[PDB]
Symmetry: D3
Subunit: 322 residues, 6 copies
Amino acid sequence: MFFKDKNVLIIGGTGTIGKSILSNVLQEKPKVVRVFSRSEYNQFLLQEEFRDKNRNIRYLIGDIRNYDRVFSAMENIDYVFHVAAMKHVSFCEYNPFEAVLTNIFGTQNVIKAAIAQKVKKVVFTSSNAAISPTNNYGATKLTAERLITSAEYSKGSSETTFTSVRFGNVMGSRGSVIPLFENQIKENQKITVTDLSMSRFMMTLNQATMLTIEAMKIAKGGETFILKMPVISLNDLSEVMIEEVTKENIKIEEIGLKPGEKMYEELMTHDESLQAFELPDMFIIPSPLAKRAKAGFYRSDNQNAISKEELRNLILNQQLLT
Amino acid sequence: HMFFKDKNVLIIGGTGTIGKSILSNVLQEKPKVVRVFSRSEYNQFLLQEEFRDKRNIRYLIGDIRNYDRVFSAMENIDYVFHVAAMKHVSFCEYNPFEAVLTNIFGTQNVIKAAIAQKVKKVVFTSSNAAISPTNNYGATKLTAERLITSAEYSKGSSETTFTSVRFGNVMGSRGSVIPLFENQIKENQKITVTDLSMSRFMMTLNQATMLTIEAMKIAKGGETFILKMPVISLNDLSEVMIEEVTKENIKIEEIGLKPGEKMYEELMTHDESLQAFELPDMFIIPSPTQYENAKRAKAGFYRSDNAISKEELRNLILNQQLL
Amino acid sequence: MFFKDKNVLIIGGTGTIGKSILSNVLQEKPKVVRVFSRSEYNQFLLQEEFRDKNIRYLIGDIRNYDRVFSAMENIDYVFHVAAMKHVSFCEYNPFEAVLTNIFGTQNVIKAAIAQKVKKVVFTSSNAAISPTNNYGATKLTAERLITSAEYSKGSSETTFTSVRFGNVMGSRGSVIPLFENQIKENQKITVTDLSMSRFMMTLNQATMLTIEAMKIAKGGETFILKMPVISLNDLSEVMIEEVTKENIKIEEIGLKPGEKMYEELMTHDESLQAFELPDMFIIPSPLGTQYENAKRAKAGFYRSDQNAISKEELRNLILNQQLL
Amino acid sequence: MFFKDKNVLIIGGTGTIGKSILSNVLQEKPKVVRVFSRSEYNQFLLQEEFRDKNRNIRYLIGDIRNYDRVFSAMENIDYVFHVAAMKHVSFCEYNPFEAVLTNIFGTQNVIKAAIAQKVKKVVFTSSNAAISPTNNYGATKLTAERLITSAEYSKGSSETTFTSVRFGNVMGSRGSVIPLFENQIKENQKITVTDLSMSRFMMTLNQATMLTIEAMKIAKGGETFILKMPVISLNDLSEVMIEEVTKLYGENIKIEEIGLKPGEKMYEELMTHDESLQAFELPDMFIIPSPLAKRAKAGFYRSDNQNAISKEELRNLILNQQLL
Amino acid sequence: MFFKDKNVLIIGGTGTIGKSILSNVLQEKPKVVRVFSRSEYNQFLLQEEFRDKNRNIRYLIGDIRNYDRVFSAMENIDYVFHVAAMKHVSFCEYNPFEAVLTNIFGTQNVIKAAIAQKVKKVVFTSSNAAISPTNNYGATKLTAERLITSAEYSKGSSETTFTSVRFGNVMGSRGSVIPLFENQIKENQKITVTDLSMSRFMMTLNQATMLTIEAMKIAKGGETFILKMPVISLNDLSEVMIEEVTKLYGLENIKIEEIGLKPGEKMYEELMTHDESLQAFELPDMFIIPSPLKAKRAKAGFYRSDNQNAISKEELRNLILNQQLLT
Amino acid sequence: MFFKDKNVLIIGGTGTIGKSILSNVLQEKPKVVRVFSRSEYNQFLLQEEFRDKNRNIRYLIGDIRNYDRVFSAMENIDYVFHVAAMKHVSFCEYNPFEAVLTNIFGTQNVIKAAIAQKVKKVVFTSSNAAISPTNNYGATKLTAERLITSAEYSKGSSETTFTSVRFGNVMGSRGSVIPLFENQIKENQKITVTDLSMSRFMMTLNQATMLTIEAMKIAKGGETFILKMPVISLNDLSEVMIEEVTKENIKIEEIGLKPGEKMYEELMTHDESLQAFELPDMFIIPSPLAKRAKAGFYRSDNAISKEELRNLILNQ
Ligand SMILES: NC(=O)c1ccc[n+]([C@@H]2O[C@H](COP(=O)([O-])OP(=O)(O)OC[C@H]3O[C@@H](n4cnc5c(N)ncnc54)[C@H](OP(=O)(O)O)[C@@H]3O)[C@@H](O)[C@H]2O)c1
Ligand SMILES: NC(=O)c1ccc[n+]([C@@H]2O[C@H](COP(=O)([O-])OP(=O)(O)OC[C@H]3O[C@@H](n4cnc5c(N)ncnc54)[C@H](OP(=O)(O)O)[C@@H]3O)[C@@H](O)[C@H]2O)c1
């Protein structure tokens, strides 16, 4: 229905999530989709993969740090998926200003080009790290989320609607723990662990993709979407993983804790739970500037983690192994 | 006249509550110069006519957003105080990119110019807002804190030293509740109350001033100094204000929460408490070094969530000349 | 009448004249007024002073184009009131004065054209005429910026007018509040050169002059109000007299660097073009517009330099607008 | 030996030539090697590849379009390997301004920042495609080569040294024809072939890696080193690539004519004729001195104008290195 | 005809080709023509030279490195001629980042500004140096040429058209060999010869002017127009120049000093790569190369100045005389 | 003497005064002179003129709106002549912000790059148009002059010292009245006159060259040098010109005032006469942050006669 005959930009289209959004949107036969990123090699690989489907896809090389390039990329465009970002906790500690240029300054650049190019809607892909952040990456997402909600509230005349979406661990994404364990087994027969008492809300690629695309379609403006998500144990994941890659003399090595890392991650602040709504599969938090959700602390701490066996089925079902 | 005697000092943000206090404390120690750096000529004027006889000061108008101006402001300077910021919570939610500019991009400029001009020590003035933040201001100050942390790691060949200092509410500061409620009664016999069940760590002007001067004096880089503080309930504050300002059929309006406001504040994260040192009056969180008789902290949480009494708060206000 | 349900932006609205314009404009029931200034403490206090009375508050620096651009989003009328106004400060920090007064004034013009703003009224000074200091040179360059924009408009409909004041009595960081608070505290007064003279004006006078140009102007004009001349000599005695309610030190501080001994309403060369209303001079751009009640002005100088108002008149002025 | 307890930056250290240069420098026990790349996920892989050798390495995220970030990466550094670029002919024609930012504007940021941080040497990693180019990519290298010679000539009093090295096809390097053909056979069983009569000068990874390190150690500044490389027909390569990839996995496989991509050259050249008139020869190398020991013969050094290798030597070469 | 009552910007109208375009565009009687140049003294001369014709002409001081100023010069303008550049081979090798700013970064500013102001068409003025170049100058012109084609390809929904023209040595144009040799002969009685064996494609000022103006009128967008031009030997040129400059000022026994090549100089020039000659169209007096990114077909082969017969000495002399290239 | 074995940059060295400084400086046999300007064409002409003296001279293309280029141009330089500017009254009126970039914003660039490259002295070339200015150009030189002073006053630790020099009309300079009339007579026989009742202090090319080079050699910092100049009548100039070029049916056209123009020019404000010093052929105005000058207004409001003028012109 929704995207048929429209002009879409996907900023970060070579990344785990951008590629997933591309091909679902492509099924609605859109007039065009434009993939925006910095790295030619990754666009090269993208081009090849879409060999015979490539008529209605276009590949811009650009950096979201550069305004005039965001702007040109945003010409005659209806929908902007803003999915570019520095996502690694450690990299955004060792390089904390670099994290700012991409996540914060890049966001203002995206916002501002969307106002000027009279874009219809913009969907910002945030994280549960933005809640009560222990690290610079999360600080930059909390700032970016403030940037997006401000944009909506001070629009003025603009017809451009601004929205956020909020992820937890997208399972098996670029640089994530699941591929790194799968690799470290096969090659080294040694796993690299931080702290097995750690906790995370996690979610499938499609879960993350559908949230985002549903957001484009339903988004009113100034709101945040948070999917209802299962908690996963880092102990459970390590054992379930070491087992399933074998198809069992692996040495679990304890490396410690990467700078900034949070022991647990939270879907929303308690203060947000006070104004937040509850749908079947998802929460909606309206702009700070129709069913009520239960007030409280939605931590991964507080949730019964799914059991080793329920987790095992989840990995093998979504096929996160090469 | 020990440490600063005949040295060259830059107070960036020196026109303001805390910058002015540092200015007069540092000045007793007989420094060779103190450069006061600030954007607004009205404030430089006012402060300049306050010191008409106290010769030792240069007054530089400029903006920490402009690196070039920060760079020349640091020329031949021994000790920088980075006190400039946007400090209201509400203003950083409604003008959130403006906050990034002053609080983040501005803090880089300090770090980059200090390195380039071979400054001896830089001291950043942060908030307990930067712990487990609920608002853009808090996040910007956490990011700034990490900029200061990283700058100390990446130093390289540089001798320049980067330190943070972390405050809670400096009682009676520019744009704060104690002046507000006072002047709201005076004029409109009305109080604007947000949520009376809020709690804050709060401190005196002198407390924050000496904390910042102490860290400047003894820091080798990487640390974060926190003075331990009385906890203050807003419910008691409202009452004690209505009582003492009258000297009492005064309206109490409930504006409600301003956006992004946090119900309590926190001196440090749980992970920080794991490496924290304890002193009698203070905490020192080191970087990922010995201090005169400091035990290791009690790990755990440091939330304002138990408050000082109403007659204590009365005294604290009255003895401070806050009215 | 004029501002009813229209959209207004006051660049520099926290300040002496900014606030004065703000609330005059608000009386005409305008759809919104956006206040634009940098300093959050000042927006805060003003926010509290308009706690019932429709007003967006934006933090921004005119040195940043992008911020000024979004400030003018969908706006009809703009008041460009922000500058550095101290003479001493613009000599001691001269490049900072270029940034706010010149570069910043571009950003307004450029952004107003960009967002198709209906009218812009620039607040200038007597200082811009035959200037002896950087500030006045910045205001001269501002003025020519504004005139040029109006000429090279092209297809644009944005109109650019200048307004040109003299000392707005009791404005932020000026001598009347200074001397008052100098006596009260120090029993001392800082006097520069007592044979100085100034055209000076009321806060409301300068407010109405600026609201006039908004309503009336077709672009290119520089409006100057006719103004009483005031001796500093007389001001200093009158001040020492009224603030006491006995013996008070009068310190010779001397000239602050760059200061002019007298001020001028227009250049001689402008008097050859100038129009004359009863209480106003309008200088049309060099480039045949009709104003009502207007005859041609008389060629010559318009210096303050002999015909100063009396102490009697002056103390009456200072006492009547409650300036203490 | 040379790099012992030195500080080294590899601008572009994550990709093919950067990684190979890194591990070769590491065997001489330098104090530190820094690695400068934009993409955190490529640094994440490299960082994991050097699991327990890492104490010597630092990982810097940054862009050479950013002077300030290039500058801080150069702090107290002795040796710079400028290896970052857009290197794809197609991408550089469809995004030519991007190519200008990284290949030219970055090269100057490098020059300017090395001068400012008092680096010893900078080796610029250019292509033979900058000679009589038919594309933007080549034009950026020509310009970049021309920036490197200009820095040297007007050094003034800088001790910093500037040199270029000039590769032809580095076999198997990220996003090039050999891994594409293997992959195209594996997944689809089609090879995609532009124009089969194209010829290319091709070198191995270590031929390149050691060209750049030699240059690093030996250069007197303003020079250009190029390695004598064998020619390879694309006729032979495509044939050889199917033969061998089919063997490894399971040769009745399609060949699809694509024709040229925009700006693709038919052959490449190591130096223009003019360069050939003042270049020096060593057994395995040519050295062009600055435009601003044994001397070569003139002529047209092209892939055109030199006998290729045989199918068999080509296959042999491919086997001793890069399949998957 | 075409420019009747239109608005025109000649970015670089103070120079040789920009002035000639100005006066040619002026006879079709447009609403306004704007001149955009950095140098006030050059504008001052032009101003004074157009004593009574100045009324539909405006004089905008400005720099194409400045986007914002390129922007406002283009306001509500219909036809942009981008004729500004550093065009000296030697200068662009010794100041190559300056060449980048003026020749590349400035071309982008034009492109970006022209799209933003909804201009109708733009004609970029390239050189035949862009073909298989041996210098930074020709490096930047290839790149500029490339920016122009890219603009067109991804226009998007912009109606703004982009086209390149492509010149050879424009005779008597500012800072060129002919006024140099004349003046050298006058003032030091000896010329400076790089390398007499060099050959060059050379066109008249009117050939250059008409080429550009035609491409303004005709161009669909993304094409490249090149004029069939005669080859000139520098041997003949140096000889002819000494003869005729002597005949005038009344002096032919004057020194000839071999300087050798300046850095980056090419021996011959080329109108197009061989590759381009396989898609290019021939007209009587002109080739049209279409866009490489998206009616008579020309012959293939290498169109060089060493690969085509010069004019004779005597034809050259006729030319140099009839073009009034002496003073 | 003073410039032997030194490294001199001349910013704007292709134009009237810039060149005059180049060749005088060259007699003192410096190690190097760098000529810095925007225009390749003008450098080209300058390279040809100096063809057999050019080992000493370097030729940089750069715009003083661009810091990094001014900076690199300043590498290892001892003395900087800041002679580049937008100088026409009219061009600075129609193009007012362009004039700010070059005159004001350019000057900050020189100053800031001078401090960084530890340049020994910097001499700024201003105009008496800066006094009580009627035009934007005047506004921008008064602002520039201030910048230079402010740079000296807040140096801090730098050894770089900043100095200004104030010209009136440099006779026969680029784009000026005398070359315009000489050309206008021969080709058209119309002179184009603004207001014949105008007034100007005027000075020889040498005068201004020597003022500037002296300021290099002597200057302590923060001072302005003004040379004692003769006043010339635009009536006397227009006739003297027509007579000598014709050497007289040459019609005179009154075009009127171009925008911004001042009827007279002034060596200093009254306010500066209160602090200025006098010398044989010069005034010295010290930093607002030796013989006293007589106070009063140094307006061009006695002129030199028709005959003294004619001698001045024919003597060059
Ligand atoms: N002449 C030839 O033989 C020849 C052959 C092939 C191609 N071309 C091309 O033809 C074009 C014109 O050649 P031409 O012979 O007429 O050159 P020219 O006489 O030097 O003209 C150059 C023009 O551009 C202006 N300019 C230079 N830099 C500028 C900047 N940054 N911003 C704005 N304006 C600038 C110049 O005036 P100011 O210096 O006053 O700013 C002048 O108006 C050039 O693009 C060149 O590449 C020429
Ligand atoms: N002539 C007088 O009567 C007089 C009177 C008062 C003051 N002055 C002052 O004396 C100085 C020189 O006057 P002049 O007669 O020599 O003028 P001029 O002949 O026009 O010389 C101007 C010089 O500055 C260069 N230039 C212009 N803009 C530039 C920029 N953005 N970046 C770098 N270089 C630039 C010019 O180079 P190009 O080759 O690029 O054009 C040229 O070399 C100026 O500061 C002027 O204001 C002169």
